[PDB]
Amino acid sequence: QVQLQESGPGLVKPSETLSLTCTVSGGSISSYYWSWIRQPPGKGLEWIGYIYYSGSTNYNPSLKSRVTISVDTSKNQFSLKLSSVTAADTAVYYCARDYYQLPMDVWGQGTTVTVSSASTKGPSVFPLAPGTAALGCLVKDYFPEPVTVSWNSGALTSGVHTFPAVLQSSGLYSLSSVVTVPTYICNVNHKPSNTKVDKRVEPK
Amino acid sequence: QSVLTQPPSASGTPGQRVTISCSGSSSNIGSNYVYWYQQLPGTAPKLLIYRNNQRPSGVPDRFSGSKSGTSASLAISGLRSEDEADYYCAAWDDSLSGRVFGGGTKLTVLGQPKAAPSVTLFPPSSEELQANKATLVCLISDFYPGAVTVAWKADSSPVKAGVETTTPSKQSNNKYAASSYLSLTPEQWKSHRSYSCQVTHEGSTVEKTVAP
Amino acid sequence: TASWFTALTQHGKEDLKFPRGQGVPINTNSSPDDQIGYYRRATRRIRGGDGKMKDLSPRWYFYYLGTGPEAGLPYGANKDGIIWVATEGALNTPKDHIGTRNPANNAAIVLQLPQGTTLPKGFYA
C-alpha cells in the first residue's frame, strides 16, 4: 500500500543547490528511516543519507560537507538539500524506507536531475507516417531528460517501445516512440519545460 | 577496506545455479548485516535478501544469501531468463557511519534463441521539411543477440557525418532494439535520389531504402 | 527497539535500581567518557490461547545519555519508568556520536555487566 514519489527540479545550474522532496502516500513517516539514494546514468548506486526519529541524521561522509536532509511530519514528506552541485551530481535520485529489519524495502520511481549551465527547452514533435505496420512520432530537440511518451492517452501499451534518447552535438536530446499495429495520437510530456504535446499520425 | 567489491559481470545457463560475491572489511560485512538488491533496466532496486539470509515476501525462494568473515554471497538456483538484471550488495559501515553499496554485477542469462531484427526506415515528415529540417529515422527491434551495426547509404554512397546511433536495449518480449538517426538538410534530401539504412546482425544484413 | 543492547527482564515486583558507579553495560567500542546513560521500562500485552490479554514481565532498555526516547531528559530527571546509571569518570554530555541502533543495520549487543555488579532481587539474565 505504501508508495513513494520524488518531486522537484529536473535541472540545476552548477555550483547551485539541489532540492528534492519525497512524498509518502499509503503510510506515515512514523519512526521509520527514510533514505535518499542516487545513481548516475549507467553507474552504480550511492547512498546519500537518511532521517528518522527526532529528525536525527546520518550522511555519507563523502557528501557530508554539502548534504542536508530534513523531514516534515505534517506534510508526510522528507526532503534532500545538496549544495555546490557539480557534474558528478547528475543522477537519478531515489527515496526509500527502512521498515524495521528490512532496509530500503520500498523505493520511489526516482527523478532524473541533471547539472548543466544549458537551459530547458521543450521538444518539437513530428509524426512518423507508416499485415502489421509501424508508426510513431519523433521527439526532437529537448533538454533536459526525461520525456515520457504515451499513446492514445496511455490506453495503448502493446507493441509500444520508446527508444532511449540520443545526445546531439548541439547539446539537445532526441528520441522516437514506435507502435506496432495491423486513430493514433502520441502524447509527449516534458516536465522540465512543462509542455504536453500530442500529435496525430497521418498516413501518407 | 571501506567499500564493497563485486565482480562486474556474471552469466549462467538457465535451470542451473549461479552465485555472486561481495567482498568487504571488518568495518562493514565483518560486523553488520548484508542486504542484496536486484535492479531491472529502467526500474528501481528491489530488496532480495536482508539480515544476511532472510527473504522478504514475494521474493522467489531460489534466491539465497550467506555471509562468512568479511565476504557475502548471493546464490540463485534454477536460473531463469527473467533473472537478467544488475545485483547490488550493501551494508552498514562503522568507519563511515553510513551505508555503503557494492559496484554491481551484470547478470546475463543465456539460452535465448537467435532472432533476426525488424528494421523500419522513416522519411522526413512534411512538417519537419517545412521547418527547413530533415531527419531519417531508422528503427531496429525484435532481435537477439544484442549486436548490431548500422550503415547509411546516400545513392549507393556511404555517409559518416550526421549519424547518431543508440546502444541496443531490452524490450517487453525480452529481445533487443536500437535506433539510428541521420540529420539532413532539406536540400540534401531532395538532392539525392535514394537514402538507405543498412543493419547488420549475425552477419545477416537488412537494408531499407527511402526516396523523396 | 532502538537500544544498542538487549533488555533486562524484571521477573519479581521491584523496579530496576543500581548503586552509584554501576549499571552501565560494557561496550568495547566506547570510551570511559561514554559510560553514562539511562534505562527505560516497557511492558507487553500478550493474547494467550484462552483468548484473553495477559501481561508479561516488564523489560528495561539501556540508552546512552542524550539519546533514545528520552534524549531531551537531563541526567537525574526523576520519572517513573526511567532510571539512570553512570560509571565514575564519565562526562555528562549527550553521546550522539554513539546514537541509537537501526534494526536493519546490526543486532543488539548482549547486555553484560562486569563481575562484582549488584543486581536487585528479581533481576537475572
Side-chain angles (χ1 to χ4, degrees), chain A, chain B, chain C residues 2-125:
Chain A
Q1 196 196 15
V2 158
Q3 308 187 22
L4 279 67
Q5 182 53 63
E6 309 83 346
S7 64
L11 165 64
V12 41
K13 173 94 64 172
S15 299
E16 302 242 347
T17 291
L18 194 159
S19 304
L20 282 166
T21 201
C22 180
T23 318
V24 183
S25 61
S28 176
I29 297 291
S30 186
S31 58
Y32 309 120
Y33 290 69
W34 301 93
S35 296
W36 279 106
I37 305 95
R38 70 181 191 178
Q39 185 183 33
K43 298 319 292 172
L45 300 163
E46 195 198 358
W47 186 77
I48 301 169
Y50 60 20
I51 187 166
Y52 44 108
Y53 195 85
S54 77
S56 309
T57 183
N58 280 83
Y59 296 135
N60 193 329
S62 199
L63 318 169
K64 167 186 51 56
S65 323
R66 312 180 279 116
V67 61
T68 288
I69 300 180
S70 80
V71 73
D72 226 325
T73 317
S74 60
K75 324 294 178 175
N76 251 14
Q77 68 182 38
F78 70 105
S79 319
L80 175 71
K81 242 69 162 56
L82 184 64
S83 287
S84 291
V85 294
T86 60
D89 301 314
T90 285
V92 184
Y93 284 75
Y94 298 98
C95 47
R97 174 196 77 173
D98 290 8
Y99 186 85
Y100 297 110
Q101 56 257 300
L102 291 88
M104 304 189 287
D105 67 333
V106 177
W107 295 62
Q109 75 168 168
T111 44
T112 295
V113 179
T114 46
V115 181
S116 179
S117 69
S119 279
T120 58
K121 180 202 152 51
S124 305
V125 60
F126 300 101
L128 299 196
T132 331
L135 59 96
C137 61
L138 171 82
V139 177
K140 206 179 76 199
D141 304 329
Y142 69 93
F143 181 89
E145 277 175 321
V147 148
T148 65
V149 190
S150 77
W151 276 96
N152 281 336
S153 308
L156 254 172
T157 301
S158 280
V160 183
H161 187 72
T162 292
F163 286 88
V166 81
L167 181 59
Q168 295 150 336
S169 303
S170 65
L172 298 163
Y173 288 104
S174 295
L175 61 82
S176 299
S177 186
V178 60
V179 182
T180 328
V181 70
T183 303
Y184 312 89
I185 297 184
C186 90
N187 321 91
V188 182
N189 230 27
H190 193 234
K191 165 206 174 189
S193 74
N194 257 37
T195 54
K196 170 208 128 300
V197 188
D198 318 306
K199 188 68 70 195
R200 297 180 178 178
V201 183
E202 305 192 312
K204 296 301 179 184
Chain B
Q1 287 188 63
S2 196
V3 284
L4 304 187
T5 295
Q6 296 174 242
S9 59
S11 60
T13 306
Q16 307 199 10
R17 169 177 296 160
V18 60
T19 83
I20 301 180
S21 76
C22 178
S23 178
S25 72
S26 71
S27 187
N28 36 75
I29 296 179
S31 160
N32 305 287
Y33 296 149
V34 188
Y35 21 96
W36 292 85
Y37 298 86
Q38 177 195 58
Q39 186 181 34
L40 292 160
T43 68
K46 182 194 184 73
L47 179 62
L48 287 184
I49 294 296
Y50 72 95
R51 253 213 268 270
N52 299 330
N53 53 17
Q54 296 297 294
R55 243 175 287 106
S57 55
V59 178
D61 58 316
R62 65 181 185 268
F63 288 96
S64 154
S66 61
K67 179 240 272 187
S68 65
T70 49
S71 292
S73 170
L74 178 71
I76 314 175
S77 305
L79 194 58
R80 308 185 64 81
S81 20
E82 315 84 299
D83 297 328
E84 219 184 54
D86 291 351
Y87 293 86
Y88 293 85
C89 61
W92 188 260
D93 197 309
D94 298 333
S95 163
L96 304 179
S97 264
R99 184 167 295 166
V100 181
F101 283 99
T105 306
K106 249 275 181 170
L107 182 56
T108 310
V109 186
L110 324 174
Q112 180 172 359
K114 294 164 290 183
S118 60
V119 165
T120 313
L121 183 56
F122 281 87
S125 160
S126 324
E127 253 287 0
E128 187 191 358
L129 293 166
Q130 227 275 18
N132 294 334
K133 291 292 166 53
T135 318
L136 282 78
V137 195
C138 193
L139 300 185
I140 315 142
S141 59
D142 287 351
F143 59 94
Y144 186 81
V148 127
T149 90
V150 171
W152 287 87
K153 309 274 101 169
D155 274 336
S156 191
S157 301
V159 170
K160 266 55 187 158
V163 167
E164 267 290 0
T165 317
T166 64
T167 297
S169 64
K170 282 73 51 191
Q171 46 184 35
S172 294
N173 51 32
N174 204 23
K175 278 181 265 184
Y176 273 87
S179 61
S180 189
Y181 304 81
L182 198 282
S183 294
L184 205 59
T185 82
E187 11 134 293
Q188 306 191 234
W189 171 238
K190 321 158 181 255
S191 302
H192 302 63
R193 272 275 215 77
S194 159
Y195 275 86
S196 257
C197 176
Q198 218 174 344
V199 174
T200 309
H201 160 80
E202 189 128 342
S204 305
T205 301
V206 296
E207 49 278 308
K208 291 287 300 308
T209 301
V210 63
Chain C
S3 174
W4 284 100
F5 303 89
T6 52
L8 273 167
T9 308
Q10 172 182 340
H11 305 284
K13 76 205 64 54
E14 284 207 337
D15 307 3
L16 180 57
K17 306 293 164 183
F18 292 103
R20 58 208 310 158
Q22 290 188 332
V24 160
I26 300 176
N27 187 1
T28 316
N29 297 288
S30 76
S31 177
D33 311 329
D34 310 317
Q35 326 294 56
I36 170 175
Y38 71 95
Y39 282 87
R40 189 175 117 90
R41 191 240 310 268
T43 66
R44 179 57 115 79
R45 297 179 179 177
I46 209 62
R47 338 172 84 178
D50 56 350
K52 298 179 178 179
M53 314 298 285
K54 189 178 194 322
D55 293 352
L56 303 175
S57 275
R59 334 180 89 85
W60 296 73
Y61 294 91
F62 175 77
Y63 289 100
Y64 284 96
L65 174 69
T67 339
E70 312 300 286
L73 257 190
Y75 193 117
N78 155 76
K79 209 282 209 62
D80 65 320
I82 293 92
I83 59 106
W84 306 84
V85 293
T87 299
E88 242 292 333
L91 320 178
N92 189 331
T93 62
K95 316 287 181 176
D96 42 61
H97 67 295
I98 301 170
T100 61
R101 184 177 62 86
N102 191 346
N105 288 330
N106 39 65
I109 299 146
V110 44
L111 203 158
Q112 287 178 293
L113 302 169
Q115 170 48 250
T117 315
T118 304
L119 269 159
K121 324 157 305 177
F123 276 86
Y124 53 91

